[PDB]
């Protein structure tokens, strides 16, 4: 996989973010994770964690997997990085997202994220408390 440039347009919630990619605005949905909705428990905390990570990043990047690049709603499907740190992994490691939506052929980082989830769960963090 390859990281590509993007700039923040605006934070949305724990697992969606609006970015400018190849000069066009797009909503991205983070691969392999599920955060609570804003109206659910840990939803506000997941939203805040993603917002801080992407707003504080000097360099945002998009990494597509090998399969579908957009979903049925027209959202981009990617791994999102801020200053080299994966947002998708970071959410899971903090117990703010579950590993989820693992479709065959867009699952390169699955085992990395399941190892972060095991660690969050062992530490009883957030969703796992
Ligand atoms: C993360 C992900 C979600 N989706 C679709 C499945 C779900 O369909 P439904 O809307 O029919 O439930 C929806 C979950 O996204 P949200 O968790 O953002 O609601 O997005 C994909 O098709 N591919 C993906 O990789
Ligand atoms: Ca969600």
Please choose, from the candidates 17, 2, 104, the residue with its C-alpha nearest in 3D space to the C-alpha of residue 55: 17
Q: CA-to-CA distance for 29 and 7, rounded, in angstroms?
A: 15
Positions marked catalytic: 29, 37, 75
User: How many Cβ atoms from other residues are within 10 Å of residue 42's Cβ?
Assistant: 19
- Is the distance from the beta carbon of residue 40 to the nearest atom of ligand 1 less than 6 Å? no
Which domains are present in the chain? Answer: 1-129 (2.40.50.90)
* Beta-bridge partner residues of 25: 20
DSSP symbol at 31: T
Q: CA-to-CA distance for 19 and 97, rounded, in angstroms?
A: 20
Residue 72 alpha carbon to ligand 1 centre in Å: 8
Method of structure determination: X-ray
Nearest 5°: the CA angle 48, 50, 51 is 60
Q: CA-to-CA distance for 15 and 17, rounded, in angstroms?
A: 7
Q: Where are the alpha helices (DSSP H) in 1-129?
A: 43-56, 87-93, 110-122
Can you say how many angstroms the Cα of residue 56 is from the centroid of all Cα atoms in its chain?
15
Furthest-apart CA atoms within the chain: distance in Å: 42
* Residue 119, token pair as written in the block: 């660690």
Instruction: Please name the residue whose Cα sits nearest to atom 18 of ligand 1.
Output: 29
Calculate the alpha carbon distances from 101 to 10, 34, 82 in Å.
Answer: 24, 8, 22
* Ligand whose nearest atom lies closest to the CA of 17: 1
Q: CA-to-CA distance for 65 and 38, rounded, in angstroms?
A: 27
DSSP symbol at 75: -
Residue 10 alpha carbon to ligand 2 centre in Å: 17
Indicate the burial class of 109 (C-beta count within 10 angstroms; 0-12, 13-18, 19 or more).
buried
For this entry, resolution in Å reads 1.5
């Amino acid at each position: 996989l390859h990281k590509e440039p993007a700039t923040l347009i605006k934070a949305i919630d724990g697992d969606t973010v609006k970015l400018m990619y190849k000069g066009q605005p797009m909503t991205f949905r983070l691969l392999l994770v599920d955060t609570p909705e804003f109206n659910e428990k840990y939803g506000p905390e997941a939203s805040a964690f993603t917002k801080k990570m992407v707003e504080n990043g000097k360099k945002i990047e998009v990494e597509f997997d090998k399969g579908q690049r957009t979903d049925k709603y027209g959202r981009g499907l990617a791994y999102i990085y801020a200053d080299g740190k994966m947002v998708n992994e970071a959410l899971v490691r903090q117990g703010l997202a579950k590993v989820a939506y693992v479709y065959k052929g867009n699952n390169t980082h699955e085992q990395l994220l399941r190892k972060a989830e095991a660690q969050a769960k062992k530490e009883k963090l957030n969703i796992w408390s």
